[PDB]
Amino acid sequence: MVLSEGEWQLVLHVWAKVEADVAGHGQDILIRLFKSHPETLEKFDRFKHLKTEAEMKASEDLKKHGVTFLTALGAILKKKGHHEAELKPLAQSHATKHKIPIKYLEFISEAIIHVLHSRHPGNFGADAQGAMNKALELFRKDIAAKYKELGYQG
Ligand code: HEM
Numbered sequence: 001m002v003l004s005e006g007e008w009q010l011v012l013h014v015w016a017k018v019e020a021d022v023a024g025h026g027q028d029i030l031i032r033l034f035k036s037h038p039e040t041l042e043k044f045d046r047f048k049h050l051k052t053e054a055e056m057k058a059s060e061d062l063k064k065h066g067v068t069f070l071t072a073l074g075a076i077l078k079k080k081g082h083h084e085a086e087l088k089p090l091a092q093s094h095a096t097k098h099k100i101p102i103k104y105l106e107f108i109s110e111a112i113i114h115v116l117h118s119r120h121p122g123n124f125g126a127d128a129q130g131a132m133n134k135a136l137e138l139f140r141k142d143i144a145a146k147y148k149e150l151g152y153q154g
Contacts, residue, residue: 001138007131008080014116014123014132015077018070025115026066031056033111040104073112077135083142091146101153102144109136 003011018025031053034041042048046065050056072090076083094100113132116124124132148154 001134001141003081003131003134003138007134010128010131011077011135012080014120014128015074017120017123018116019074022070022074023063023067025119026068026070027057027063028115028119029070029108029111030062030066032114033108036111037104037107040107043098043100043104076139081138083139087139087142087146091143092150094143095147095150095152099152102140102147105140105143109133109140112136 034047034050034056035053041050044065047056047059047062050059050062056062072086076086076090079086113129113136116132117129144154
């Protein structure tokens with residue numbers, strides 16, 4: 001699939017706001033993911049033991065990982081579709097080291113869209129949400145094809 005330049009502008013316009021508080025957004029997103037789909041928390045051997053949302057908020061480690069994850073996703077969205085290099089090392093680790101099924105990438109996509117809707121309603125109307133959703137669908141599609149080349153799932 002190919003986004004238009006007007007669709008990438010809606011995605012990078014709301015991302016510019018996210019980047020004013022990277023740690024905050026990375027933390028909200030992971031917590032939302034772990035609350036909504038608790039099974040995903042099991043894939044993190046470093047966080048697995050956190051029992052409540054209050055424990056998750058207080059975790060400095062979780063907050064450091066939210067920064068790492070969001071910064072890597074930002075770098076991919078700023079490429080505007082030309083992200084092949086950035087996707088290779090990410091596909092290799094998530095398929096072979098971490099073993100993250102595509103279904104979980106769909107769950108985190110849902111958590112990203114929930115948090116931006118919540119924190120940025122004026123910049124995340126229907127058209128902006130449709131463009132972000134396309135950008136994450138493009139990312140999931142490319143990653144799924146790389147997973148299949150690497151021998152995982154498909
Ligand atoms: C937009 C999607 C995602 C991005 C951009 C992202 C990026 C990252 C990055 C940059 C790292 C550190 C380097 C590496 O190991 O590759 C990482 C680590 C990891 N990721 Fe992801 N990731 C994504 C989705 C997920 C999903 C949905 C899960 C689990 C449900 C997941 C589980 C992990 C785990 C288990 C690690 C290791 C954490 C630790 O022990 O250090 N990732 N991820």
